[PDB]
Structure formats: structure tokens, C-alpha cells
Design a protein around this ligand. Structure first.
Ligand code: HEM
Ligand SMILES: [Ca+2]
Ligand SMILES: [Ca+2]
Length: 306
């Protein structure tokens, strides 16, 4: 089983090295904390948190970086390489890329103002990447609530609290116009905007993402505190200001009887949200890990050891 003390003897300073790397990167890229948390999420939803997402292409298997949910979206890979190299220098062949990314995600959340906790450790690295599985398992912004729930349950997270709390990751970070164009101009072939999108916010978003405009333009997930990890994300949902369809459905879907109370509870108390986020994060981080002698302690997160 995974344990927070896994490296307390072999690499006591791993968390500090990870933190230092992120602090340094944040000075030039304020979006990196968000990007790193998302990398961990996309790692865990595909064959578990096994650093499979970090692997590059080989002639035998395709990289998950070309999955619909990762291509021209997932970022921060060089930063992970940097901290990995630093950790390898401090403690040779000790910390797995899977664990490194987990610590990076937690440190990223804390650095952005979120809760601080010690993540369970002991994960090992995959011997292959899973592009098809990534295309099948990663949720999409156009998913209905039932589909979002299906996606989470498919990887092992049965609880609505898992879905609602982890969606809080959208309390910071960026989103491309491409993913909300339907909500803004033609939702579900209705020829009208998504009725669950606040009409005042609708105008603002249309200004940032005009029809036939730059689909790659970036918009903040959280209009209240774009780069701070806090519970404002849920306050937005209550006002119909969730940015993407999957955000707003947590509060407005006909199937949201179970998620609405969670959204309200997280909007009403930072402590309630933070506690639930840590609980959900550790649950996601416990998805089908390779442990013991399974897999490897990858030296270069981009390639399997040979
Ligand atoms: C519930 C289903 C989810 C869907 C459909 C979803 C969808 C997306 C989409 C469309 C983007 C924008 C990517 C881009 O424009 O390049 C994104 C970004 C992001 N997501 Fe989610 N997401 C989900 C859950 C989560 C979870 C569970 C976390 C982490 C706990 C997370 C963390 C993030 C972060 C922090 C970003 C910003 C990354 C950056 O700015 O580099 N997401 N997500
Ligand atoms: Ca994975
Ligand atoms: Ca925020």
C-alpha cells in the first residue's frame, strides 16, 4: 500500500526539491502550477498514476501526448524533466516519475494557495504508454453529467464528492475558446447559447471568443481568482458562471440532485472544500498504482529504462 513516508529515508528532501522547481518556474510561467496538477490528473485517469503520460513516442507504442485530451493542451513536460533531473542528482534512481508527478501536483496546489498535505507514495513507473486508453478515459468538456460520472466511475472513483471536489481544479488555469464555442453560439444544435450560462458572463466570453475567432485563445477557468487555488470556482457555479459545460452541469444538470449539495457546501466553506479536495486527490492518486517491484523507477521520464 502507498504511504506518505515512502521516501523519508531514501530521499527526505524530494518534496522540497519539487517545490523549489515549481517556485522558480512560476516566476516566468504563472500557469505552471495549474498545468502540473492537470498532468497528474491525466496520468491517473489512464492506467493509473504510473507516469505513462510522460512517455514519448516509440515505434511500438504511441504517446498519450497525442490523445484528444492532451494534444495541444497538456503542458509542463520540460518542468517535470527539470525536477526529475534535480531529484536524480539528490537521490539517484530512487524517486519514480509517477511519485514525482504526484508530489508536483500537491506542491502546485499548495503554492497556489490551496491545502497542504503529504501525499501517499510508493508508485512505480509504467513500461508503456496508452494512447487509445487515454482517448477513451479522459473526460471531455462537452460531457453531460451522466457521462462525467461514468468517466470517473470507469477509473475507480464512484463518489459524487470525487467528481465535484476534483472539478475544483478549475479554480485556476486556462481553457481554449475552442471548448466553449458551442455554449456561446450554438449549443446542442439549438442555434442558441447554453441557457445555463449566465447571460452577462455570456457577453464577456463572446468578447473573448468571437465567432470565427482564434479558437486557441485562452480564457480563465475562474473569473474570480484566475490563479489562486480557492473555492471561488463553486461560487461561480452557483451564479451560472462555470466556464465549460462540464463545470456548470455539476450545478445545473437534471441529474445534479447529488452534486448540487456538494457544490453549495464547497462554495460555503473553504475548509469543507479543501478537506474534500485532499480526500479526493488521494483517492485519485490511489488509482491502480504499480508498487513493490512492479514497473520501474524511470531515470528519464520520457523513456522506459533499457
Ligand atoms: C471533470 C472533468 C474534466 C473535464 C471535462 C476537464 C476539461 C478540461 C479542459 C477542456 C481544459 C482546457 C485545456 C486547454 O484548453 O488546453 C482543462 C484544463 C485544466 N484542468 Fe480540467 N477537466 C476535468 C477535470 C479536472 C480535474 C479532475 C483536474 C485536476 C484535479 C483538472 C485540472 C485542470 C487544470 C488545472 C487545468 C488548467 C491547465 C492549464 O492551464 O495548463 N481538470 N480541463
Ligand atoms: Ca497513467
Ligand atoms: Ca480561484
Amino acid at each position: 500500500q502507498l504511504t506518505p513516508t515512502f521516501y523519508d529515508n531514501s530521499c527526505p528532501n524530494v518534496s522540497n526539491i519539487v517545490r523549489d522547481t515549481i517556485v522558480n518556474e512560476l516566476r516566468s510561467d504563472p500557469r505552471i502550477a495549474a498545468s502540473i496538477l492537470r498532468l497528474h490528473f491525466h496520468d491517473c485517469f489512464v492506467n493509473g498514476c504510473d507516469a505513462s503520460i510522460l512517455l514519448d513516442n516509440t515505434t511500438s507504442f504511441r504517446t498519450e501526448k497525442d490523445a484528444f485530451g492532451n494534444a495541444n493542451s497538456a503542458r509542463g513536460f520540460p518542468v517535470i524533466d527539470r525536477m526529475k533531473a534535480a531529484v536524480e542528482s539528490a537521490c539517484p534512481r530512487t524517486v519514480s516519475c509517477a511519485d514525482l508527478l504526484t508530489i508536483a501536483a500537491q506542491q502546485s496546489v499548495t503554492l497556489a494557495g490551496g491545502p497542504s498535505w503529504r501525499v501517499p507514495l510508493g508508485r512505480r513507473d509504467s513500461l508503456q504508454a496508452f494512447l487509445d486508453l487515454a482517448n477513451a478515459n479522459l473526460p471531455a468538456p462537452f460531457f453531460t453529467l451522466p457521462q462525467l460520472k461514468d468517466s470517473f466511475r470507469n477509473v475507480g472513483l464512484n463518489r459524487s464528492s470525487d467528481l465535484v471536489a476534483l472539478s475544483g481544479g478549475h479554480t485556476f488555469g486556462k481553457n481554449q475558446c475552442r471548448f466553449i464555442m458551442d455554449r456561446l453560439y450554438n449549443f446542442s444544435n439549438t442555434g442558441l447559447p447554453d441557457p445555463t450560462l449566465n447571460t452577462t458572463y455570456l457577453q464577456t466570453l463572446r468578447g473573448l471568443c468571437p465567432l470565427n475567432g482564434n479558437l486557441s485563445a485562452l480564457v480563465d477557468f475562474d473569473l474570480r481568482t484566475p490563479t489562486i487555488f480557492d473555492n471561488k470556482y463553486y461560487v461561480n457555479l452557483e451564479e451560472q458562471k462555470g466556464l465549460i459545460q462540464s463545470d456548470q452541469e455539476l450545478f445545473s444538470s437534471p441529474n445534479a440532485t447529488d452534486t448540487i449539495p456538494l457544490v453549495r457546501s464547497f462554495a460555503n466553506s473553504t475548509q469543507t472544500f479543501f478537506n474534500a479536495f485532499v480526500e479526493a486527490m488521494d483517492r485519485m492518486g490511489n488509482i491502480t498504482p504499480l508498487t513493490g517491484t512492479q514497473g520501474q523507477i524511470r531515470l528519464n521520464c520520457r523513456v522506459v529504462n533499457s
